[PDB]
């Protein structure tokens, strides 16, 4: 199981500067050496490289676009099978009720419980009711990952109104909740932990130097 | 000349997770894409890789330890020659009063003006008196890089007492001053820029995920 504490997301998609299984493995080692308790990573190859450099538990996803679906975080059994092969300890998937290319969310949850019974699952959700649906499906973890990143949560950011959305998720489910998405600073990390999340996933604030650089530059441009 | 704004230090020494000319070239790309106006980098190998990735001006150093000297930032003509070969726009060196392994600081300054007349020079100093000595030697930039990092500045950090050390440096010299050392947040970057530095160097806050991870973990340990 994931400990309490800091999960570092070590992702770099094609065309991002640090894109490379190798580099993500080194970002993960850096996170490990700074006191991270887990890693979140994207694609079987990045996960396998990371698992060569750290024994931290990994939350695995496959970001892959499908025609006629806005679901891209572990959309189908093809991505699930890649992640089972990766041996990541936790499989994260979009747990919205948006249209998927193939299996439904219920079918992907059954698929994972049948084919990878020792793997934990994590629901990336955007709304309280998606969170409650995930809790009902027996998700091990419910993350705020997609809050602000679906067509229907545009402009919503986890931290808004002192983490009201996070407070509402924590109030609505007994499952382990993960503060993920727009945890930008140590102060935000402390706040989500004090609000009672099991753990927090921090990505861009640690592993996206372009995004960190932009925050430094923006302070001069207000 | 270096513009006003943010210089990103893209360094990873041999024991650090990201040690690699290729990775530091990508950190530099990320800095560029985020709005940096320059790069500080270490070793000819890293500098050449960065200079083929971005056209941003580079402050080059070679960190290399010598016996019977505490000077490790561009200590001798050997490091200077590596930086001349690198074609970096600015050569930075330890510009402390500390005894060097070979040439004196004064000797090295003469050497650079002779052997690389088109290169600007940056004085990494620890004290106001070293800043004044650097102005004496005609340095183009005076950075606060070694303030707190010498045997005679123990316990001091750039930000202490609302950047009093930086205020004292800026009052002491007419040369372009660079805020470097422990500039860890956008707030600190804003502050040193508002105090009148030419530019600021931010390293670990952007390019050392281990260091950033430690600050996240640390807020849960206070
Ligand atoms: C919507 C989406 O794709 N999210 C990604 C999912 O893996 C990453 O953003 C991940 O959550 C990283 C943590 O977010 P941040 O960079 O700290 O804001
Ligand atoms: C004393 C020393 O070795 N300094 C290094 C000089 O290259 C780095 O610290 C460099 O100044 C980068 C700025 O420091 P930070 O990583 O932003 O805190
Ligand atoms: Cl980046
Ligand atoms: Cl690091």
Residue numbers in the entry:
A (entry chain AAA), B (entry chain BBB): 1 to 222
What does the paper say about this structure?
The third step in the sialic acid catabolic pathway is mediated by the enzyme N-acetylmannosamine-6-phosphate 2-epimerase (NanE), which catalyzes an inversion of stereochemistry at the C2 position of N-acetylmannosamine-6-phosphate (ManNAc-6P), yielding N-acetylglucosamine-6-phosphate (GlcNAc-6P). The crystal structure of NanE from Staphylococcus aureus, which comprises a triosephosphate isomerase barrel fold with an unusual dimeric architecture, was solved with both natural and modified substrates. NanE is essential for the growth of S. aureus in media containing N-acetylneuraminic acid as the sole carbon source and has a highly conserved active site across both Gram-positive and Gram-negative bacteria. Based on our structural and kinetic data, we propose that NanE performs its epimerization reaction using a novel proton displacement mechanism mediated by the substrate.
We aimed to examine the involvement of the C5 hydroxyl of ManNAc-6P in the catalytic mechanism. Two derivatives were synthesized with substitutions at the C5 hydroxyl: 5-deoxy-ManNAc-6P, with a substituted hydrogen, and 5-methyl-ManNAc-6P, with a substituted methoxy group. SaNanE was cocrystallized with these ligands to obtain ligand-bound structures. Unambiguous density for the N-acetyl and phosphate groups of the ligand was present in one of the monomers in the same position as in ManNAc-6P. The ligand was fit to an occupancy of 0.66 with phenix.refine, with citrate fitted to an occupancy of 0.34. The center of the ligand appears to bind in a different orientation to that of ManNAc-6P, notably with Glu180 interacting with the C4 hydroxyl of the substituted ligand. With the ability to form a hydrogen bond at the C5 position removed in 5-deoxy-ManNAc-6P, Glu180 has formed a short hydrogen bond (2.5 Å) with a different hydroxyl group. Mutagenesis studies identified the roles of Lys63 and Glu180, and crystallographic modeling highlighted the unusually short hydrogen bond between Glu180 and the substrate, which is retained even if the C5 hydroxyl of the substrate is removed (it now forms with the C4 hydroxyl).
